[PDB]
Amino acid sequence: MKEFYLTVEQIGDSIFERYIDSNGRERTREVEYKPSLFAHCPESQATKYFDIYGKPCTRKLFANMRDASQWIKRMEDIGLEALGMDDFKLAYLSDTYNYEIKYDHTKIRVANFDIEVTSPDGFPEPSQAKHPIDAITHYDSIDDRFYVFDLLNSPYGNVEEWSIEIAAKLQEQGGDEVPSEIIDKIIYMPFDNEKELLMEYLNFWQQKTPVILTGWNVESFAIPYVYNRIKNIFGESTAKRLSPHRKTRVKVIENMYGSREIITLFGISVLDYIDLYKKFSFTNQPSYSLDYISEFELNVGKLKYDGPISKLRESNHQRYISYNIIAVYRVLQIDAKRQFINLSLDMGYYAKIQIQSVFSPIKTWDAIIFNSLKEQNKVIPQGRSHPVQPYPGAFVKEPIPNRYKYVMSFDLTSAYPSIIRQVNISPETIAGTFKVAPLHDYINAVAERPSDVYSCSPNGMMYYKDRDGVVPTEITKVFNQRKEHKGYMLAAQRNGEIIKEALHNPNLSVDEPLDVDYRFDFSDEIKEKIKKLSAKSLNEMLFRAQRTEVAGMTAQINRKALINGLAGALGNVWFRYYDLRNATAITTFGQMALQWIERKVNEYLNEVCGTEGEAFVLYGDTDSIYVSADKIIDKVGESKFRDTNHWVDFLDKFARERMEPAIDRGFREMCEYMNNKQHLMFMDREAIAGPPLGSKGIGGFWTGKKRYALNVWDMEGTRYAEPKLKIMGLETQKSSTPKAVQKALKECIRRMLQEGEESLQEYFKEFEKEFRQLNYISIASVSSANNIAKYDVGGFPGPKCPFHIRGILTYNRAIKGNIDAPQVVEGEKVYVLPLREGNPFGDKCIAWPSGTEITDLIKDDVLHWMDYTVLLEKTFIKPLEGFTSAAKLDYEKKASLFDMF
DNA sequence: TCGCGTAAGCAGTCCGCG
DNA sequence: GCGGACTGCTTAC
Ligand SMILES: Cc1cn([C@H]2C[C@H](O)[C@@H](COP(=O)(O)OP(=O)(O)OP(=O)(O)O)O2)c(=O)[nH]c1=O
Ligand SMILES: [Ca+2]
Ligand SMILES: [Ca+2]
Ligand SMILES: [Ca+2]
Ligand SMILES: [Ca+2]
Ligand SMILES: [Ca+2]
């Protein structure tokens, strides 16, 4: 097999590399790597190395990496560019793995661990590590075993051994319901004392040294706690055994409001799953506790226990250990679903970066572009300082707030990357500038043609047409990967809908789910077999289909995010290829393209409808248009349609056969107008929306920019078994809106779009009547909470104190003196409830950590004083009044006598 | 919230508006 | 009351 790296580090003048050799074995080596860097040289000086602008460079070979670094400094002192890859480990990987890397995940040691620490005096600070580590569960991917390290004797209590037999039993048997599929994979090691536990953990770690290290909050908690605790007990040299090169560094992570410390373990790649989740999941969650996320992702119940966590070990050590094991397994279950580890490996090996660098599109693209240019003996420019400067973005059309009955939407495939490729936008393809006219003059095709030589953007920039830039070339490669995976995603989605249909008529049989590849549209034979399956088998197939869809979604959307991140990186000052000329070339072309095609679509439709000046495009945002189809439907007549699916088909055909050719013609003209390198503006139909045939549903409404709802029957070629709501921006989509309120508002919208005004009025009346019985957590607002200290004036709110911050200060006063009470963590999320006047908390709201029950110290008083009236008006009624006035109906039946009878 | 971009919405504070 | 200036937070793209 081909060799591949596992990790790479620079330590002084050595590269330390862990890798898999040609026999599939893990090895480590220290290499005295001599880097090269570059300087411009005379034309007379024959060379094979050229910078990206074609200027000749001489290569400078250094005796060692420190000399290379010192040379860069002196070049700055002189005031000359020092060219080349200054991150020497990326250069090392480029030299050592000068081929497309084929990796084998089965050889990569992926470790998932979690620790427990009993603490009676509040949160156990990792930087102090003053409490014993009393449990570690460490799952190893190569062994496929859960290694459980259990402390039996502690200053906080001596306990009995954990019982695997009780752990396996149902909770209804008094057990812990540790999943049966992992029971035989548990290797249980009890310890008489903490020193022997930790010494054994370190010997184990030595034997089975993680390459990828993950878990939940491991980077911010478990790793620093373990490192500092071992440091406290044994000394630094022992703690550094967590690094295979015995090198560690305290790294200070800074943000706007403060900083925190992590421990960098050289020769390990830490991918904390909470951070993978935040980057790759495209959720915004009210809470990021593992319980909350597990429930959300897996539909597993919360891990239940009595009393505070600080007393769990002494009261119920059995459960204590079982929950530590389950916590590790839940992360593995989330990854089986979401596949973020697989994603990180793919992207990291593609770029030839340290795997942990997948968190950084700047680093990822820097490496991709360096490797690409190096192949041609081209030399990358030095990174430079730039002041941060604002620049313009996308165009968003102001919609007329209204109901909109029939809507067809269209948008560009990978808009910004497509613009890059079409215009040929790249650092080295800049050809010059032209004299810009107002944007509207380009939109209306009255401005002078910018160039007869070069490919142009309406921001004034011109680009070469003879050759693709490195940015277009490399962005195309990732886009193509994205496109492949999106194909699989949509296939699994469509396959999912076939199963849902078949589920209307399940067979009374005992059979099995079919063995199929859900990434490909089911053949006729598979469809026939599905129609004969039991509900049981169908449901199992649906679950598998949806898991395949999720896998495709992860692969596609994060490749989309990477290529989109390159367009954004051009506008970030730390990017080697930062250039506002290029960043604004993209966005300004985008603005033009949307408004150009709006004009073209309106023109086309006015022509087919025989009108003038009618606005068929009602909305657009960045790269999208929403087209009113009322007139199209009315031209055949609603009476002519057999059912909902009939007019959906008719609009689908109209979009494909009439609209899309019209749009394509519009964009080809624009391409020629801008003299672009290649026409790549592909604006495909997204959604077909409308009320159910014969209903009083309104179909859709807009309240304003970035705020709308549609009842969608077909989305990017997926024809739904049941209509689906596409809701953007409205309170149903915001993590700040209470859970039960999102649900209620969604049902109000459903009724509006599908059933009409009377149905809406029915539901509102019921919700208003019953909501006071909703669980307090389900009706609490949510907010991130920054700058708690800034607004805290002796325990009370200072000037301009935000409402949620006020809530926290109230909480802080109410729990004062308690070290055991849960603390609100700066920068994390809180639940927020309003309080009625005259309450014992002395203020109008209280807040507490999100994803948790409020402490029993004050729960009863919070419940008694909760202001349901304010809660209802603020979170439910106010948004609903916005929706209904926009859509021109009433959520309450207006008095129009009779009545009178 | 360490790790790519801008546009733009709503809640809430403070305070004017005769 | 509500709007504008402003801070804070969150979402669409
Ligand atoms: C979603 C998203 C979009 N954008 C910008 C770049 C996108 O090309 C542009 C349009 O957004 P989208 O239409 O969401 O995405 P897309 O056109 O890149 O991909 P698709 O083929 O799935 O439609 O908006 C970002 O800069 N960051 C983001 O997170
Ligand atoms: Ca725990
Ligand atoms: Ca798009
Ligand atoms: Ca599309
Ligand atoms: Ca059947
Ligand atoms: Ca779009």
Between the alpha carbon of residue A599 and those of residues A246, A255, A271, A606, the distances in Å are 65, 44, 48, 11
Which residues, 6+ apart, have CB-to-CB distance to A523 below 8 Å?
none
| Closest C-alpha to A648, from A626, A664, A633 | A633
| Closest C-alpha to A406, from A794, A689, A792 | A689
Question: Which residues have CB less than 5 Å away from ligand 4 (the ion)?
Answer: A 684
Residue type, A171: Q
What's the maximum distance between 2 C-alpha atoms anywhere in chain A?
104
Bridge partner residues of A10 (DSSP): A15
Q: In CATH, which superfamily holds the domain spanning A109-339?
A: Ribonuclease H-like superfamily/Ribonuclease H (3.30.420.10)
> Rounded to whole angstroms, how far apart are CA atoms A9 and A355?
12
| Closest C-alpha to A866, from A769, A768, A776 | A776
- Indicate the DSSP class of residue A19: E
Is the CB of residue A639 less than 8 Å from the CB of residue A694? no
Is the CB of residue A748 less than 8 Å from the CB of residue A880? yes
CA of A413, nearest ligand number = 1
Distance A734 CA to C10 C1' (A): 7
Question: Computed from CA positions of residues A611, A613, A617, A618, in that sequence, does the dihedral angle turn out positive or negative?
Answer: negative
> Rounded to whole angstroms, how far apart are CA atoms A160 and A438?
79
> Rounded to whole angstroms, how far apart are CA atoms A118 and A109?
29
> Rounded to whole angstroms, how far apart are CA atoms A268 and A305?
35
Which residues, 6+ apart, have CB-to-CB distance to A393 below 8 Å?
A587
- For residue A782, which nucleotide's C1' is closest to its Cα? C9
> Rounded to whole angstroms, how far apart are CA atoms A470 and A457?
18
Between the alpha carbon of residue A863 and those of residues A54, A426, A770, A779, A853, the distances in Å are 72, 60, 16, 12, 12
DSSP E strands in A407-554: the ranges are 407-412, 430-433, 455-456, 461-463
SS3 A36: strand
Residue with CA nearest C1' of nucleotide B6: A393
> Rounded to whole angstroms, how far apart are CA atoms A356 and A344?
8
Between the alpha carbon of residue A424 and those of residues A254, A445, A468, A624, the distances in Å are 37, 21, 6, 22
- Indicate the DSSP class of residue A429: G
Q: What is the DSSP string of A758-781?
A: HHHHHHHHHHHHHGGGS-GGGG-E
CATH code 1.10.287.690 region(s) in chain A: 469-572
Is the CB of residue A250 less than 8 Å from the CB of residue A149? no
Question: Computed from CA positions of residues A354, A360, A364, A367, in that sequence, does the dihedral angle turn out positive or negative?
Answer: negative
Rounded to the nearest 5 degrees, what angle is found at the Cα of A783, between the Cα atoms of A777 and A786? 135
Q: For strand B, is any atom closer than 7 Å to the CB of A51?
A: no
**In Å, what resolution does this model reach?**
2.0
> Rounded to whole angstroms, how far apart are CA atoms A183 and A833?
42
> Rounded to whole angstroms, how far apart are CA atoms A223 and A219?
6
A383-468+573-729 CATH: 3.90.1600.10
Q: For strand C, is any atom closer than 7 Å to the CB of A706?
A: yes
Q: For strand B, is any atom closer than 7 Å to the CB of A685?
A: no
Which run of H or of E encompasses A136?
Answer: strand A133-140
Residue with CA nearest C1' of nucleotide C10: A734
Helices A415-423 and A580-609 cross at an angle (nearest 10°) of 100
Q: For strand C, is any atom closer than 7 Å to the CB of A537?
A: no
> Could you give the dihedral angle defined by the CA atoms of residues A523, A529, A530 and A532, in that order, rounded to the nearest 10 degrees?
160
Substitution candidate for ligand 1 out of A623, A681, A682 with most atoms within 8 A of CB: A623
Which CATH architecture does the domain made up of A775-866 adopt?
3-Layer(aba) Sandwich (3.40)
Smallest CA separation from ligand 1 atom 29, residue: A561
Using the CB atoms, write b or e for A177-212: b if 16+ within 10 Å. bbeeebeeebebebbeebeebbbebbebbeebbbbb
Q: Tell me which nucleotides of strand B come within 7 A of a protein CB.
A: 1-14
Which residues, 6+ apart, have CB-to-CB distance to A66 below 8 Å?
A12, A13
SS3 A220: helix
Question: Computed from CA positions of residues A734, A729, A869, A894, in that sequence, does the dihedral angle turn out positive or negative?
Answer: negative
CA A10 to chain CA mean position, Å: 31
> Rounded to whole angstroms, how far apart are CA atoms A371 and A305?
53
Which residues, 6+ apart, have CB-to-CB distance to A586 below 8 Å?
A416, A419, A420, A423, A425, A457, A567, A570
CA A226 to chain CA mean position, Å: 29
Q: For strand B, is any atom closer than 7 Å to the CB of A590?
A: no
Ligand 1 pocket list (CB less than 6 A): A 411-416, 560, 564, 568, 622-623
Rounded to the nearest 5 degrees, what angle is found at the Cα of A240, between the Cα atoms of A235 and A246? 135
Q: For strand B, is any atom closer than 7 Å to the CB of A219?
A: yes
A596, two tokens: 């150009």
Q: What is the Å distance from ligand 2's center to A324 Cα?
A: 6
- Indicate the DSSP class of residue A211: S
Q: For strand B, is any atom closer than 7 Å to the CB of A786?
A: yes
Q: For strand C, is any atom closer than 7 Å to the CB of A397?
A: no
Residue type, A772: R
Is the CB of residue A62 less than 8 Å from the CB of residue A35? yes
Alpha helices (H) in A132-179, listed in sequence order: 164-168
Smallest CA separation from ligand 1 atom 14, residue: A414
CATH code 1.20.1280.300 region(s) in chain A: 730-774+867-889
Instruction: For residue A418, give the ligand 1 atom closest to its CA.
Output: 8
Bridge partner residues of A223 (DSSP): none
DSSP count for chain A of H helices, then E strands: 27, 31
CB-CB neighbours of A285 under 10 Å? 17
CA of A216, nearest ligand number = 2
> Rounded to whole angstroms, how far apart are CA atoms A55 and A57?
7
Q: State the distance between the two ends of chain A, measured CA to CA, in whole angstroms.
A: 88
| Closest C-alpha to A223, from A138, A348, A102 | A138
Smallest CA separation from ligand 1 atom 25, residue: A564
CATH code 3.30.420.10 region(s) in chain A: 109-339
A469-572 CATH: 1.10.287.690
A383, two tokens: 């990174």
> Rounded to whole angstroms, how far apart are CA atoms A203 and A893?
73
Q: What is the DSSP string of A309-341?
A: GGGHHHHHHHHHHHHHHHHHHHHHHHHHHH-HH
Instruction: For residue A623, give the ligand 1 atom closest to its CA.
Output: 10
Rounded to the nearest 5 degrees, what angle is found at the Cα of A291, between the Cα atoms of A289 and A296? 100
Q: What is the Å distance from ligand 4's center to A486 Cα?
A: 10
Question: Computed from CA positions of residues A733, A738, A739, A745, in that sequence, does the dihedral angle turn out positive or negative?
Answer: negative
Q: Tell me which nucleotides of strand C come within 7 A of a protein CB.
A: 7-13
- For residue A415, which nucleotide's C1' is closest to its Cα? C13
Is the CB of residue A842 less than 8 Å from the CB of residue A813? yes
> Rounded to whole angstroms, how far apart are CA atoms A560 and A813?
47
Q: What is the DSSP string of A818-863?
A: -SSSPPPPTTSEEEEEEB-TT-TTSSSEEEEETTSPPPTTTHHHHH
Q: What is the Å distance from ligand 4's center to A683 Cα?
A: 7
Which run of H or of E encompasses A555?
Answer: helix A535-569
CA contacts within 13 A on the Cβ side of A320: 28
CB-CB neighbours of A25 under 10 Å? 9
Residue with CA nearest C1' of nucleotide B14: A800
A781, two tokens: 């607002």
> Rounded to whole angstroms, how far apart are CA atoms A150 and A192?
9
- For residue A409, which nucleotide's C1' is closest to its Cα? C13
Q: Is A841 exposed, middle or buried (0-12, 13-18, 19+ CB in 10 A)?
A: middle
Q: What is the Å distance from ligand 6's center to A455 Cα?
A: 25
CATH code 3.30.342.10 region(s) in chain A: 1-108+340-382
CATH code 3.40.1820.10 region(s) in chain A: 775-866
A1-108+340-382 CATH: 3.30.342.10
A730-774+867-889 CATH: 1.20.1280.300
